[PDB]
Amino acid sequence: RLMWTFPAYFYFKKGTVAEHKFLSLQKGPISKKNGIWFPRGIPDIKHGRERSTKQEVKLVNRPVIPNDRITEADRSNDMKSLERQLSRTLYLL
Amino acid sequence: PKSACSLVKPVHHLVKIDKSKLSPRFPELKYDKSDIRSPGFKPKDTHADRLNDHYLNTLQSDLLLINYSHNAAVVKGLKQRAWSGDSPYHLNRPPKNPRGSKAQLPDIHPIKWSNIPGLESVVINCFVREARENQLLAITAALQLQQITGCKPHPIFSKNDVPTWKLRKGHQMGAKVELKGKEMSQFLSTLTEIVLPRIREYKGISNQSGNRFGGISFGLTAEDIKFFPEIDANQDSWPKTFGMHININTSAQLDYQARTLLSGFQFPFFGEEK
Amino acid sequence: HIWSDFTTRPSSLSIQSSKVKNYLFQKKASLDPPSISRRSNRIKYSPPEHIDEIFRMSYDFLEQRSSKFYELANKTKNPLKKDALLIKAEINNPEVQYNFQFNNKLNNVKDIIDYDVPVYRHLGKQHWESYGQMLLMQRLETLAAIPDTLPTLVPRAEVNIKFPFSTGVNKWIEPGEFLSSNVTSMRPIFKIQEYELVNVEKQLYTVLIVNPDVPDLSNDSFKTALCYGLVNINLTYNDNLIDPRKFHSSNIIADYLPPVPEKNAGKQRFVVWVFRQPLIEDKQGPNMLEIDRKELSRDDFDIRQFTKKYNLTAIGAHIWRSEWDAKVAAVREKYGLPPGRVFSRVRR
Amino acid sequence: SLSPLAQRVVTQLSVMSASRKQPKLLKLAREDLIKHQTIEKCWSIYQQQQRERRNLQLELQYKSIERSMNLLQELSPRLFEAANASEKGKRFPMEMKVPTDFPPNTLWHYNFR
Amino acid sequence: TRITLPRRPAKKIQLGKSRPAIYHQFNVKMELSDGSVVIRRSQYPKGEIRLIQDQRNNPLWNPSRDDLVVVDANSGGSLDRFNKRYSSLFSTVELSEENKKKTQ
Amino acid sequence: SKNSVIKLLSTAASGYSRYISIKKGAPLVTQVRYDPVVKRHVLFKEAKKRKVAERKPLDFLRTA
RNA sequence: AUUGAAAAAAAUAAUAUAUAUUAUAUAUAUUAAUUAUAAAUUGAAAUAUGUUUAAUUGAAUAUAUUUUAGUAAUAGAUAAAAAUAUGUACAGUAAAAUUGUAAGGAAAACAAUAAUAACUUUCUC
RNA sequence: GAAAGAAUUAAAUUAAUAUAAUGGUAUAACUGUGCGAUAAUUGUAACACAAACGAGUGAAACAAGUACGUAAGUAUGGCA
Ligand SMILES: [Mg+2]
Ligand SMILES: [Mg+2]
Ligand SMILES: [Mg+2]
Ligand SMILES: [Mg+2]
Ligand SMILES: [Mg+2]
Prior knowledge:
- The structure is cut from a larger assembly and holds chains A, B, C, D, E and F.
- In chain C, 31% of the residues lie in helices and 18% in strands.
- Chain C has a six-stranded mixed beta sheet. In chain C, strands 1-3-6 form a three-stranded antiparallel beta sheet.
- In chain C, strand 4 and strand 5 form a beta hairpin.
- Chain D is 59% helix and 0% strand.
- In chain D, helix 2 packs antiparallel against helix 3.
- Chain D is mostly helical.
- Chain D is built from three helices and no strands.
- Chain F is built from no helices and four strands.
- Chain F has a four-stranded antiparallel beta sheet, with no helix packed on it.
- The radius of gyration of chain F is 15 Å and the shape is flat.
- Chain B binds two RNA strands through helix 1, strand 1, strand 2, strand 3 and strand 4.
- Chain B: Pfam families: Ribosomal_L5, Ribosomal_L5_C.
- Chain B: Keywords: Mitochondrion, Ribonucleoprotein, Ribosomal protein, Transit peptide.
- Chain B: This is Large ribosomal subunit protein uL5m.
- Chain B: Belongs to the universal ribosomal protein uL5 family.
């Protein structure tokens, strides 16, 4: 909510395919126009964000697929494998 | 002005007066910066911190055990010597300087459960000497710092006039940044995990480096700065990149404790230690 | 769930407005803030996301802690420890915080802020110490009211003063303020709010207004005059407004005479001091004291000797300032005082 | 009249600057302000308890260290001196890595050297 | 001789109105050489990235492991072409043929 | 030598004036001071017309 | 007031209205803004009737109006780089030397360098 | 036992002071900052210091109006 506007004008140069596709992905805000009533307040936009609300930006090359935090040892309740708890500390008894 | 004579009148009570509360001015500076009503408000704890959690879970106990010394005692530092009163001229004579130093040195306490070493801050120094001819390189260096770290950089201005180096005074030669908490944790994590492994011939940090009372400093070149994710992502916007010094300030009473702590955080060391 | 219980807990530890209570304890973000009166503004407003369930969990945590504090308080015996534990138990209550923060603390309403309750008393103490006490001490020190009248002051009660009978307007006098003769012509009323553990059924208070600036030509100096004096006054945490309703002629050791400065006699300071009488044990009922009225000077007063002789300890103070104007003659005539003197313009 | 380098650096310092990028001030109702106050008090108390639990654990560990040292000193001075020998040059193993938030493909390595 | 861009009259940021600086950052996922992933805050609009050379495949940080393959950037420069150009020779025969020189 | 003299004249049509020195190229001086004839603080401006140095107006509403 | 929705509230302050006092006070009402200021055929948005389209909807084209982009440093009552040398109010402490640190060396820039007995608030055994 | 405050003590006037040298300055007179740009205003000036004269120096107080300050108050150019 208290976050700055994204300066896309620096991360995407003029007239480039990346800039075009980023713009296509993004959804613009509502501009103020005389003769209309805006119950939530007259829009106040600078650099493409409505200042009264948060701003949402959507974005060998295979996607990142994280590994499961629970292991075969976890499910099989193996008391000897060194994987029974990847987040806890184990101690030898 | 009738006179220049500072003099504070004594009071007749023990009540502490802060005039910032009696002045109706500056209403919004009366709130603490942690108060949601303050315009200076900035959320602090937004996510967990892997490095801090690791240090609290594992390294504190190990460091305590390692640094334990049986029946240890405080080693007092070099302090100002006192004149023996064998001559009257010693009555109001200022004390003497420490034996070997012109500055006093701190005492070293035994490591105990309350004073285990830990990281307290990181400061990055970027002084572009070639900015003497071009002031815009300072802005570029500040952007490099902002992208690498994520904190607000602060400018560095020339202070001395050295002709041989053609360095004037009062000009912007670079930028600095100080990191604490999660942000320094992230910076160190990314350094160790990405940048240092990508250096050509990297053996670690010199074991004879750091101020003698806790704190380790080491540098990075421009090619080394090119390894950070932000620069690699948009190489196009980085025709030129600048190196910088990195100063890690810890709670270590002495330097070797800080070296052990950083080794715990996976910082290699190669040289022979003092 | 001790905070939901009110069998023994005072009813003031709850928000008396059902709408605000329901909004603060709401289950889903379906209601709207009662603070925002206009619907338009209510639609414009948007509460921070993910705020009610975190609030529920924080409430549960704080309430468990408060329950532990109440458990230990029910077993403690020393009254000071009992009061401290009660304060620690109810300090974090959202309802208490709401009530105190957003309701009057001076003309408090018993059902919102009850000063019989330790938590409200402690929060009031903190509020007073934040701003009011510092200003009082600054005014006393700067106007030199402390050394001139009494050696020092350790504030322990909030004293407010007003002049309701004189003009008809309502205003609590700021310390060190200049008041007109018309304003200060009739009589002041006091309000002494106490924030410490004091036995309401035994303790008695005295109030002295003195002027340590009345000129004295015998030695070319000043002297102190007892403007006003009351003794044997009993207060209560919630009923502590002194006025001719709450005292008798036996409490008056010196009827009120107004500020009547003389022309070119300087700015005079009228300082109010509140003392608490000794609290003898092994005896039932308030310990009243008789003032030696044939020894009281009333024009050559010695306040230090007075308090030393009657074993009084100051707990609060106030001050205002006065200077000559046109209405002084009228006040003198009205009170049957002789015509005022006129002093030179130059101090030689 | 400016150079393309000037424009580039002005864009960089635009990314620096806060002009035309910050949202409106966050104004909260009285009730939500009280809610937030309770959240922060709860979190502060919680973190204090966590810190104190860790501190107590370290106190107990240190007490154990000193008790063990006394016992070993009185039982066998040779082993006591071996234990009390300094570890000034000690470093941690280089694979005692800081935990990450998702595990690797090979969870554990069962061979070495 | 120095080049500088002119200073404009700084806007006055009053006492109490000075807000903090919260730059826009993304919760980006960062994959190391192994299958491990770290979440971090980045200002680049790239929510996902993988590294080819990093801590998890460096001898200095990985002393215990017996085998550790190294790799560099692909589709850049003339790398690996010194092998792709010679197919007749292929991998132990050369090791045996490099027994000794017999020179003195 | 490097400094010149100037006659500041009061705005109220009272004839009162006060004199001050100023650098050869300093900006035109105007100052509020007491005017005994009208018994109050009033403005004082230059009497004659002086060759003032030219300083650029500040870039305030951003240009180009 | 309308506008997603069934008695009214009880603080400091600010704003609007009004009237008490030879008292910068009180009553009701509400809780705005807080990084902005002209000039842009050319970059990017939001607004209608055909449209292809499935009650819609929709996504794409055309125009009228409007909005954004002039992209500029301090975000801290800033504190020994350079700039305002006279007033007032609030607040702080320099300097050398030593130890380190990419280029960096005697000399550029950053970091570290005296002691906590007593007193508070909080957490905890 | 631990955090966060309030700070206290030792040292420092060697840095800095618009400018020589001397005296003074951390309670700062040095430095940062918000208002401001106002007192770098007006009519009487006692009394002192210094002093052949002529001149010079500090300045209480009365009156008029300004700026800053919650207030106490400060400001009739610059630490001298
Ligand atoms: Mg000077
Ligand atoms: Mg000197
Ligand atoms: Mg003489
Ligand atoms: Mg003479
Ligand atoms: Mg001055």
